[PDB]
Every structure is written in C-alpha cells, then in structure tokens.
Design a protein around this ligand. Structure first.
Ligand code: NAD
Ligand code: NAD
Lengths: 312, 312
C-alpha cells in the first residue's frame, strides 16, 4: 500500500501526513508532495516516528516521483477560504491546481484511487474526471470527493445535542459538499426523539454551515485544518481497509447512476478496485425529499462549472 | 481528566491538540491557550471531531480559565530554533514565557502534573521548579521535561538500521535533552548484533543530532513539529494512564536523587501523584559510563542557567 498526499506542506496536508504516518498499516509507504520548499523537511520530521511506514517528501514542479506506484492519491493542494473570499475565488485559484495534479496522476498512477479534498469539491471532482477522460484512463469507481468532514460534524453535533456517544452515532450525509447541497439524513438517526421539526432544521443548518463557525472564529487565520485532516485520514484508512478485501461503507461524492446528478454524495461499498456497489439513500422524510429536490440545481451547476473548465 | 496545552496555536501545539482530541479518554476535557488570536478557532476546528472530549480555546493575556481544574499542563509555548539561532537565543526568548506560564500554574492548578516541551528543556525545567518553589507549591514528583522525542528517534533509528519492528524496540534514553547530554543506552537493546563500536557511536550521534536533520531539511521552515506532537501526546497519555492507577514507565527529565545532576532524565514509574519510583539506569557499558561522566558538566551548567534566572 502506497499513499501519496499532494499539498502535504499545508494546514490539512501536514496533520493528514501525521495521522497517516501513525495509522497506515505496518509495511505501507507514504509520499508527500507540495510546491512549498519545506516539504522534504515535513517528511523528515515524520520519518522520526517509530512506525513501519516509509515516508518520503518532494518539492519542485514534478510530483511523478511521489506518485510512482501510488495506490491512493489524496489531494489537499490549493487555497482555503479566508474571510472576504467566495466559492468563485476558490474555483479560480484551485481549478488549475486540480487540472495540473490530476494530469500527473493519469501519467504516473492511472489505476490509483483519487480522493479530492480541495474546494469547491463539487466542481473540483468533475474537473479531475474530465482530465482522466481526456487521458483515456478514467475509472469512475476510483474517483472520490471526500465529504467525510460533513459526517464528522453530523456525528459530533447529534451526539452533543442528544447526549449520545459520538463514536457510535451513524448518519448518512448525501448530495454535495457545500452549503445547501449538504443533506444529512437526520430522519434515520437512532436513540433520538426530535423536540419538533425545528430541532431537525436547526441541526441540518449547523451541519451545512459549520465551516463558517471555524473560518469566523480563526478570523482570517484560515479554515478547518485539524478536523479535515482527521476526516481525510478516516476516508483514506477506509480505502486501505477495502484494499485488504474488507466490506467498507462510506459516504463519498462519486459519479454513480446519475438519478439526481452526474456526481452525488451517497453511501458506497468499497472493494479492492474502488466502488463495488452504490448503496440506497434508504427512507427519506418529506423534509429530506424536499431539501434534496430544492438543492439539485446548485449541485448540477457546480458540476457544469467543472466540466466546462476542461471541455467548454 | 482535564489537560491544558499552553502554546496550542503553534506547529507542535496544534498537532498535539489534534492527537489529544483523538486519543484522550471519553469523558476528558482539553483546554487550549495561546497568545495567538486564532486559538479559539483551533479549538472550534477540533470541536468538530466526534470524540467525547470537551475542547475549549482561549487567547488573551490570562491562561487562568484554561488552567482551572487542569490535571495535566503541557507547555509548548515559545520560539523554535531556525537556522542561525543558538541555544542562548532560545533561552533568552523562552525563559520569561516559562516563568510567566508556570506562575499561572502555581495560582490556578498547583497540584497538576506539568510537562515542559519548550527548549532548552534542560534549563526551562529548572526555571519552572524555582517558580513553583517561590510560590510554595513545588512537588518535584509532578514536574517533567518531556524527552520522549529522543525515545521516538532512538526506536526509529534502531529499527531502521537493524531491520526490527519500530513499534516494539525499547531503549532507555538518560541524561538531558540536548546534543551531548542525550544518552541512549544502546548496550541494552535486544535482537541486535552491533557490527562494532563504530555502529553504536554513529547511532548515538544520530540520536543526539536528529533535530538538525529536520531544522536543516525544512531550511528555515522551522524545527520538528509533527514528531514532537506525537512524542508529547505519548507522554501525556502515559500520565493519563497513570492517573487511572496503571503502572506506567517513561524516560523523563525529573528532579530525582541527584546522584549525577539535580535534574536528570531517567526511567520513572508514574503513579496517581506524579513519579512513584525513580528507576535504575540498569547496566551501563564502558562507552555509556564514559559518555555519562563526559556530558555531566554541560548538563549541570544548563540547570544552573535556569536556577540563576529565577534566584541569581
Ligand atoms: N473537503 C473539505 O471538507 C474541506 C474542508 C476544509 C478545507 N478544504 C480545502 O482543502 C484545501 C487545503 O486547505 P488548507 O487549509 O490545508 O490550505 P493551505 O494553504 O494551508 O495548504 C494548501 C497547500 O497546497 C499547496 N499547493 C499549492 N499548489 C500546489 C501544487 N500545484 N501542487 C502541490 N501542492 C500545491 C500549497 O503550497 C500549500 O502547502 C483548500 O482548498 C480548502 O478549501 C476542504
Ligand atoms: N522537547 C523537545 O524535544 C522539543 C522538540 C522540538 C521543539 N521543541 C520546542 O517547542 C517549542 C514550540 O515549538 P513550535 O515549533 O511549536 O513553535 P511555534 O512558534 O510554532 O509555536 C510556539 C507557540 O507559542 C506561543 N506562545 C508564545 N508565547 C506564549 C505565551 N506567553 N503563552 C502562550 N503561548 C505562547 C506562540 O504564539 C506560538 O503559537 C519551541 O521552544 C521548540 O524549541 C521542543
């Protein structure tokens, strides 16, 4: 098992690299790549931790050496939202970074699973799909938008509100990865009596807007880095577990059956070659059915913006 | 169990806070304090992780709120060595930070265990001891210089050189926490046939100088942050395990029997009230006995420099 992290010198990159150095299976390797000159030193820092995980670090213009033989590629490269900045600002900075790095994946490790962290995920994942298609290597089973932070948030907020164990709250989160496209299926949550519709609506809002609590409370210091690194590590370790032949189930933004949108976040069962089965959303409340049809235009617009960058 | 991290917004601080948010026992709390205005946002970032660990964050001039009810206080506050900077540069920047923060420990949580990360540890721990003594609350069983990074390095370098499992290499490291004061007892290492004296000397050197490999390879980007956060978390979790009534054994820089120096890094058994027993160094090789007597002057000089800052 070899995992490559592209953007490994950043806030998310460094914490993610630490969690993977601590938690990847003994016998694994970890390669870090970032345009930041510090990157070989980040790898040197991690190499002092006593786990049987070979860690190498690369800066420079060419991630080919980090990517050679990679099974899993995690991309946290690009700028984070600071106060004042819009989705549109992020797209303009990050689209070309995602285009550049996914071209190099197609060249060096086209059979790898690819996990996109870089925002806006909804559009960045469609960019990577179109680059892989232009290279003739696109396997839709192997490309993921990492939405796992929306799951961490949902688990935490449910457990804190309802006095539950946050380690054992399960909650599917479907749709997309931004504002109104995030749909947590609170109707399916166990061991909770909802006060009323009010409580469900307010919890849904808090899950959808949680990034702003952080962006705000850091006050220009940046966005969520440490929670996102945990979310990415959790997803990555799920893919490693699936590579060993485990049944693994995770919410991720994937090119599925296209019932609602070309890309849609849903529970998937992972096998040894990416997605093995696309799982049901299960039973939606009236509230969930309406929220689903209400955000579909935004989600399809996010996808189009990524497709149109690569293809017109 | 409540753990306070002073310096929680820095390179070490943030990664340490993440590992404690992930690993402290369910029912724990974690309070973060730093002079950096971002600190409440670091805590907000971590609060989105689904563990039963209450995380709060404080900036401003007064750590009293973070420290109220603390059982364990970890101090990573102060500047790290960049290229050009000497031990003397660090002492001048960090002495007053350690004096200030330990006065606040004496006021708000005098019965807490205190773990000093801030360098130079050899002198910073004697400063904290003299501040606690001036406040009339010093318990020498409860004050530690965290040397655990020297243990991580020793474990890793032995396992990489000798083809061993780095998760199961045990190596006592004694003396102090800088250059020639670091003494790894390589004579006691199992499952290894030393090529010759040469190999033991070169491995000892690499353990003593490992910080420079990182400071160098980051090239001004800073020193070891991610490995040090793991080392601090390991030590902290050892103290939490001891609080539950476990026999726990760790190398730490402590005011022991003073056979070699007032403060000396040695294996200690932890109980529920800090150090319960000061353990033997065991059998020293000729090489280890000579290296021990050869660095003692430097170590005693490091301690004096801390004592003399507080007392003349
Ligand atoms: N999916 C999610 O839930 C989620 C949540 C939080 C943030 N994010 C996103 O993650 C990204 C990283 O955020 P951060 O806070 O770590 O940012 P950061 O600025 O700290 O780190 C980004 C890193 O990307 C590197 N980078 C830039 N161009 C590169 C290239 N061509 N190749 C390799 N590395 C390159 C930079 O040098 C930097 O080290 C941002 O886009 C942010 O929006 C996603
Ligand atoms: N013991 C070891 O093995 C070991 C190894 C590596 C580094 N270190 C030391 O750890 C320290 C931290 O290193 P780093 O790389 O995280 O540095 P950093 O500069 O990234 O972080 C230091 C933090 O301390 C904060 N701080 C400063 N004064 C403060 C005060 N009065 N109260 C609270 N917070 C305060 C700063 O605002 C900053 O957030 C340095 O002294 C470094 O030498 C120790």
């Amino acid at each position: 098992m070899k995992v490559a992290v592209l953007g490994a010198a950043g806030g998310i990159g460094q914490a993610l690299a630490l969690l993977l150095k601590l938690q990847l299976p003994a016998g694994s390797s970890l390669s870090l790549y970032d345009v930041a000159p510090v990157t070989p030193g980040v790898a040197k820092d991690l190499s002092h931790i006593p786990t049987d995980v070979v860690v190498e670090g690369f800066a420079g213009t060419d991630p080919s050496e980090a990517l050679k033989g990679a099974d899993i590629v995690l991309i946290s490269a690009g700028v984070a939202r600071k106060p004042g900045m819009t989705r549109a600002d992020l797209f303009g900075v990050n689209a070309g970074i995602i285009r550049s790095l996914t071209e190099k994946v197609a060249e060096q490790c086209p059979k790898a699973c690819v996990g996109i962290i870089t925002n806006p995920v909804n559009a960045m994942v469609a960019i990577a799909a179109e680059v892989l298609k232009k290279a003739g290597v696109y396997d839709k089973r192997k490309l993921f938008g990492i939405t796992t932070l929306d799951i961490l948030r949902a688990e935490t907020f449910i457990a804190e509100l309802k006095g539950l164990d946050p380690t054992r709250v399960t909650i599917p989160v479907i749709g997309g990865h931004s504002g109104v496209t995030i749909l947590p299926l609170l109707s399916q949550v166990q061991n909770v009596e909802w006060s009323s519709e009010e409580e469900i609506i307010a919890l849904t809002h808090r899950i959808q807007n949680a990034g702003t609590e952080v962006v705000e409370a850091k006050a220009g210091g940046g966005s969520a880095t440490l929670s996102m690194a945990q979310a990415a590590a959790r997803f990555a370790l799920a893919l490693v577990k699936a590579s060993q032949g485990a049944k693994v189930v995770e919410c991720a933004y994937v090119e599925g059956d296209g019932k609602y949108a070309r890309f849609f976040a849903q529970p998937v069962r992972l096998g040894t070659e990416g997605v093995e089965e696309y799982l049901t959303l299960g039973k939606l409340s009236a509230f969930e059915e309406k929220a689903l049809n209400a955000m579909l235009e935004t989600l399809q617009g996010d996808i189009k913006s990524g497709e149109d960058f690569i293809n017109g």
